Point group: D2
Chain length 461, copies 4
Amino acid sequence: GFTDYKVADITLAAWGRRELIIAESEMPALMGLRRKYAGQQPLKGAKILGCIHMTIQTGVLIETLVALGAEVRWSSCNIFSTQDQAAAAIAAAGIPVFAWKGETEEEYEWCIEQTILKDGQPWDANMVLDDGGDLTEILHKKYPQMLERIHGITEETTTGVHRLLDMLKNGTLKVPAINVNDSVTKSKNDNKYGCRHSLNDAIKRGTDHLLSGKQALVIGYGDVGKGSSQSLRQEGMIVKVAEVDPICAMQACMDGFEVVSPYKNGINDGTEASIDAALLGKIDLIVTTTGNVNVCDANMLKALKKRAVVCNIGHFDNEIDTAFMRKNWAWEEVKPQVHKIHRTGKDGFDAHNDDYLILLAEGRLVNLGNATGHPSRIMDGSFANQVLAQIHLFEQKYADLPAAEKAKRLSVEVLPKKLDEEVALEMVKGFGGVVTQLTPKQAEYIGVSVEGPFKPDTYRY
Amino acid sequence: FTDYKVADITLAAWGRRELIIAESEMPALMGLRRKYAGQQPLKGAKILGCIHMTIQTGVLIETLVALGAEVRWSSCNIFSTQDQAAAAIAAAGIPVFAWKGETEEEYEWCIEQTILKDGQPWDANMVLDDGGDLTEILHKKYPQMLERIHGITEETTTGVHRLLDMLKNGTLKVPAINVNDSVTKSKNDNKYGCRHSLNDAIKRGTDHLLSGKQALVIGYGDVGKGSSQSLRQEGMIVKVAEVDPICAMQACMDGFEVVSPYKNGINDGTEASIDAALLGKIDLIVTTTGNVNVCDANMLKALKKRAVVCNIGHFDNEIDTAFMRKNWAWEEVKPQVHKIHRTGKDGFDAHNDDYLILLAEGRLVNLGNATGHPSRIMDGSFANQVLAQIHLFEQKYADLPAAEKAKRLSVEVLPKKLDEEVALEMVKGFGGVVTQLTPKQAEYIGVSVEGPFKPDTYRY
Amino acid sequence: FTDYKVADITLAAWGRRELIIAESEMPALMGLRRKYAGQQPLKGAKILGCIHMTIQTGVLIETLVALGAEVRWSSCNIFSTQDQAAAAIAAAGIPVFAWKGETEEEYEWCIEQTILKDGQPWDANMVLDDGGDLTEILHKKYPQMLERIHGITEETTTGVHRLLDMLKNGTLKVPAINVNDSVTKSKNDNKYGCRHSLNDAIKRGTDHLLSGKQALVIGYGDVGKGSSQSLRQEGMIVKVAEVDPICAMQACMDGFEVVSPYKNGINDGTEASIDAALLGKIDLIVTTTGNVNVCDANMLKALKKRAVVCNIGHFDNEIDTAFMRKNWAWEEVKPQVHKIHRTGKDGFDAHNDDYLILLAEGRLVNLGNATGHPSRIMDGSFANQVLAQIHLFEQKYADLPAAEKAKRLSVEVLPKKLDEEVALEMVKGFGGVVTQLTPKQAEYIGVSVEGPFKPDTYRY
Amino acid sequence: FTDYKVADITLAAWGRRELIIAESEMPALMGLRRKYAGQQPLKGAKILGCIHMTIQTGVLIETLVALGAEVRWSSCNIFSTQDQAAAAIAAAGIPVFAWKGETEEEYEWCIEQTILKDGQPWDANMVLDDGGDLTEILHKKYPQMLERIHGITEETTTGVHRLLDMLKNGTLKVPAINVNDSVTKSKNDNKYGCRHSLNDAIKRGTDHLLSGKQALVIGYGDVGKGSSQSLRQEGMIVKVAEVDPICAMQACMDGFEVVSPYKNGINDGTEASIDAALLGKIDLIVTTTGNVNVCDANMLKALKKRAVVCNIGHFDNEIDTAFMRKNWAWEEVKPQVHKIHRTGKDGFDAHNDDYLILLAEGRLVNLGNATGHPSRIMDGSFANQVLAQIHLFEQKYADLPAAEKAKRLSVEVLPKKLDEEVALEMVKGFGGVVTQLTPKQAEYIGVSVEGPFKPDTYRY
Ligand SMILES: NC(=O)c1ccc[n+]([C@@H]2O[C@H](COP(=O)([O-])OP(=O)(O)OC[C@H]3O[C@@H](n4cnc5c(N)ncnc54)[C@H](O)[C@@H]3O)[C@@H](O)[C@H]2O)c1
Ligand SMILES: NC(=O)c1ccc[n+]([C@@H]2O[C@H](COP(=O)([O-])OP(=O)(O)OC[C@H]3O[C@@H](n4cnc5c(N)ncnc54)[C@H](O)[C@@H]3O)[C@@H](O)[C@H]2O)c1
Ligand SMILES: NC(=O)c1ccc[n+]([C@@H]2O[C@H](COP(=O)([O-])OP(=O)(O)OC[C@H]3O[C@@H](n4cnc5c(N)ncnc54)[C@H](O)[C@@H]3O)[C@@H](O)[C@H]2O)c1
Ligand SMILES: NC(=O)c1ccc[n+]([C@@H]2O[C@H](COP(=O)([O-])OP(=O)(O)OC[C@H]3O[C@@H](n4cnc5c(N)ncnc54)[C@H](O)[C@@H]3O)[C@@H](O)[C@H]2O)c1
Ligand SMILES: Nc1ncnc2[nH]cnc12
Ligand SMILES: Nc1ncnc2[nH]cnc12
Ligand SMILES: Nc1ncnc2[nH]cnc12
Ligand SMILES: [Rb+]
């Protein structure tokens, strides 16, 4: 009798369930939590609004939250990232989900609204799980009465955390949050190694281009840029890296990359004359990794080598000036999420034109748009942290605290290191790794407990 | 001029040649000489320095002097000095007491010669240390001297741990800067420096092929990460041991198998707990931990015949070399390379097959068997050292009123802005070009166009 | 009448879009289209082709046609066709009989539709093959057709072996060119193509993380070298098995541990000879040999639960899939991905932990679960194919008198000069610039300025 | 015993210590010493040897002697001898004439001391050469000695070229084995040896950081492949130049940019032909070609200030050092390391910034600035040398009548079966386990279970 969902094709559910069963075997930290906490039901009474890519990996997260006692209502945080078989399996399990691959922007917003509302009125939500901040923003702008009864937000990704910290600085954040991104077992796992796995994967699925021997430019060298650069260099690309942060640039040099700017002497003067046209005319592939705006701009797009591939793996598509391309150039769909963009003019194109770019996923995050995002065994870490964060904020019960106590608890915090380590141990055991136990003398010598935590909070790994 | 002791002053011209090359490899340090020449911010500084007396240290010393300081110098390891560097510094009229191959007694004597001038304590007012030995001597044996010292700038992970322990116990007498935890130090020197210099030292000592052979790296912190890469890039099959599951996770994702020398990771000190099958396949063991007895006697007994054993952590006690001296016969191959014959203590057969090769008697192998990190990496570390010396010297802690000293007695890192400035100089040295944010982009991500670019929480 | 059979003709426009992209990635092959357009060297050629019906093959087919040939085409594997490529070729008026997911009976029928036109033998005079199946069928079932065929151009290592066996036995009826052993084929396609496409296929089938996990690659020839790199570059811990000690030496030096599935390398046919400890740690096994039963039933029994099993050699009999069909229960995950439940033959528990994942039913995994090698690699192989077709067609073997045909049966390779010319075009496609020898330099090393640059003995 | 000339006989005990270690790293060569000691297959052989007098060569020499040979030895390069090795060999009663840092006159004198004993031709009957200098002297100056010599075993690519030129011209007087082209030589020593030893030598000479810097490798044959990897694995950004498009294709697919020093690759002798922008960004140039003047005067003028220049090909004429001696001022940094000041010929400013660093005066840098290839790599080369000596000595060419000599006067390689046997011992040295084919698998691929496993056409 269950009908409170909207997905592309419910008949994909059996396939999705087969893939979920495989994924559980790849997610020991998350499944460890499900086993440890199922008896105690720490999320009994939790009512979680979730907005994160509706993949098979997210499916295992959802069913872990449910197994621990939560009810949820779910949507994706990107128009192209849903795996339709995952969405179907979740709907078939009696869980409200509003998600499909290839949403319009209007549909995207509608799906988030369907999580917020049940039977035309605000749902009795008391927790939020977000990736990128779009749900968080809608709640603050449109549903402040619902935020009165929400105990916390657990935010997945670097861009979302930045948005939360801006709200906090402005005094507009209404409920506390956990920055899940900055667990080591998230940032230095998912953001880096996930993109190492999934960037080359997506480019191959979209284009089937040989990468070896060809020239790439990676814009950014944070966690995503590091992983992305390795994804390409391990395939034999000649990778150049751009950065605004000299410390990240130093890392790129030491890691064996040439550090370059798209602009002469690194200065964008707003004009085509500031573009290093010689550089860009040699680039076969450009990848944006920044979380910033317009880092592959119109003038860069004009200067790129004919037939270059352009993609973004940061959270939002505005890293690349796709609006310029929609206004000025002709788009030819190769296949879904792969477009040739003909630089010859706006209205039509010659089928045999040589002067085009290939854009993946319309500039949306390419790993999820053209492939399946990060693998289960990587997302295990991120999602174990999500579950721990949900437990922590739900147990703290912020919404029920008196005003004076709320004032002390209204913050954006990370999980304690001890929990980050516990996640990591389960990941290591999944690989068959064996951690050494400190002797009492060794523990004393370095000033730690034998069980951890092992590093000071200052440590950067 | 006679206020020095080095192996051979005639090596000075060679040392100077290598200093002139090193200056061209150290743009951040040379940039500081140009920037601060006029101000002379270290005029009146009298710096006790204790750090490996290499060519790179020579460029650091001469930068401090160019900025107005006087110094008195020693090495922080018995095997790390480059005798041509020490000679060039002595020839420049700078007091230095250092040679490659000191005894422990000579090591202590050399530190004492920095502390004393013309037979009595120098009027020192600053300290630059690597590992904490000088810091410890001043606190334990010369506490009066610390009354006049404005600060300590500490280079390395082990030294910082020692400082933080003193602060927690209330025994630290002057403020310190943790130079190690600049990003342009920890995530440059500790990691990439060991990547360059570990394989270098093993080749110079043994000339062993590394490709195709089995290594075990104990630890996967900064040093262990770099060391593991040093070996894997040469084609070794590297396994990694760790106590910290987060570091272990990184090792897995970086493509290493994570193993323990002990069955199920449980080290009860018995021979039975050793994974003998594992250790019997290992051709090379490298310790990287900063901890004690992480390559223990039972592990040494179980290693494959003819395995190489070395340490790249600060102190030799990572490896139970004392057990080896007490029980097994040492055959010097050449300086800093010993075959250790497991057949007994008193004599050996020249053709015995059952030996280990120990490098540098367990002392830090990069400096012992090679020349440590390259100039262009040490540029970052040492630019931070000079900035830290300037900051603490200008603060003049010793002369502050009591209430202000209480607020300033701390162990701090340099500001991120300065870490970034050092990094920019390093990048420019490679010919790298950093992009400048537009005003709209800087607003979008919430930073100034000039930086800093990341919040203090950022881990890189 | 539609003289083709494809899955879905409406995919033609998509195929054509991808052909146009592929032409831009295949400069050697497109260069041949332009160079030989005027001459029409294949005018009058009627080519039976049997090779994976991919986008890359489509560019090859259209090159042959552009040079004057007519063709009739089928795939050489039941899972390797890209339906959009087949559709684009059919839509262009070229007879093609190919779809992804053929049965064995359909596979044979498709080859027969190339051989027969309108119910009788086509007047074929050339053969292009990959693996020998079309060659075998012609010799077995249509020997009279071979009286009119000038030659065979064979793509792959296994096909060449089959030809050489026929030649030794006196059963080969027409001469052949071994296209596999051009350097721009064997040391390009076989190696780098598998480097690109093996990890690709595993990701598409399973989306498994590879980093940190254990692989066993059986073989270290060209395919095995490329396959091992495909996995090691992703961060797998790769072990390699080999029978050839020279290839095993290369694996060691390349940084791999060389191991056998069998104790001391000796297979006794029983479970007692299996190294169960080794196989119980393997997450992924890949066969690369061109041999038979190199991942046998006893190995399959001993593999770690939930290991992935795949083959990238030409034929599925590298793995004992017959044993698995007879004894274990198969659960389709999605097309070309099966969980094989080791609990028994008749049914399975949906939540069983004791299964293996088999890709492409053991058929070549790169083509079965992905799209095979990329266009820019296939450019080299297919340029060689075109050149080989030109050469044998021009030689006109079928028109020789009977006594001379007997004398002219051989299996030859293309000259090194042509291998170099193909390589130059490939290099230019990367933007690479080859240096020209001066006359003095050419004299010094004993070559012509134009090449060839190496003696025929050279191994690259 | 006095029939020797070395730098310092007192280094002998050190050399012997290192020989004992090297024996443990050379299982193929030691396996041959054990296998053939009883039979004494080189009893009566009198071998003139000319090859780098290293510890590795010492193990080779002592193997030949252990199998019954007498020898008289010299080095094939002025900088390649390890003086402790030479001393250990002389102390063993073996005639050796070699030291590190010979003049060219001393080099020639040392070869002559091998040829002559007590002022008259020795009764030589075999030749072991690396590079052909000894071979050339015998043919030009001592043709009567060649009448009684059974063969030459030639180590390296350049020497083989010289032999093949003699054969083509009809001037080769005795047969030869091309030891270079064993797989366990060419695709071991030439490639992996340079991978190990190139970065080693650059670090020992300069201690420069390599990571992040730009290199240009001239050539991409076996030595250039290994050299490129030596630098790329350290994090250099490596560009490759080639004249052979097949090798260039390999470089592209291996992840390198292929560039020419010259515009459009045309080396017309003009300054304007140099790609000034390219050469002005290069920090390190390495020549690997075996050709002449591949790092020419105009390239040297255009290089980035403070670039390192070195050669790893056999002869120094790869680089135009003569132009540098004629035009620029040389400042010795330390032995085998010179700064070459581009400011003029007569003097230099000690602080000039416009210099290059040349290693080993352009002579092969691995041996000149380090210790050449490691023992476990040289094991393969030298096992092949021993086998080749046995083969030619047993064939007894000198004793054949003129008509029979004509049939055997050739340059040949060892049989593949022997190449495989060498490789097996190398793999066992790593602990590798090769799988044994079942009889059915051997039949399926058409080989004997024991090998050989590949046809003679196979390129590995
Ligand atoms: N696709 C995925 O699956 C995935 C995974 C994790 C995070 N993300 C997203 O990827 C983005 C990056 O995340 P991160 O964790 O790497 O952030 P980060 O802050 O670690 O790195 C971003 C980097 O971009 C650099 N940068 C900013 N503006 C630049 C410019 N104009 N030119 C060059 N470099 C510039 C910064 O200096 C910084 O080092 C965010 O939007 C994050 O939410 C996506
Ligand atoms: N040789 C050099 O030039 C050089 C360079 C920099 C630092 N250092 C020294 O190297 C040492 C390591 O420094 P670091 O910055 O990498 O420190 P770190 O704290 O980053 O790393 C040390 C690692 O050792 C691990 N560890 C501790 N006990 C262990 C055990 N019993 N088994 C396995 N792993 C264990 C820890 O979990 C930790 O991750 C320190 O002594 C430091 O001063 C040496
Ligand atoms: N999937 C693809 O796209 C693709 C590409 C090229 C070739 N191929 C096919 O791949 C196969 C291998 O081709 P290749 O060119 O690498 O051949 P190869 O002869 O170079 O290599 C095969 C290797 O297998 C080894 N081997 C044989 N039996 C073995 C055993 N029992 N255990 C371990 N090692 C064993 C051999 O010693 C040899 O080195 C052939 O079937 C070929 O036709 C496939
Ligand atoms: N230092 C060592 O220990 C060592 C080891 C083995 C061989 N060698 C020597 O190294 C040299 C190279 O040997 P190899 O086995 O690699 O030979 P090779 O024939 O395999 O490779 C030499 C390469 O140089 C290229 N080349 C020639 N002229 C060129 C030019 N003007 N510009 C660019 N590329 C050019 C050729 O095309 C060829 O591919 C020989 O002198 C050999 O005797 C030295
Ligand atoms: N070269 C060097 N000089 C000084 N301290 C160092 N620490 C590591 N390498 C060093
Ligand atoms: N893409 C491809 N097309 C045709 N044959 C192939 N063999 C391997 N990959 C191939
Ligand atoms: N170590 C070595 N000994 C002799 N010949 C060599 N050629 C290269 N390295 C060598
Ligand atoms: Rb150094």
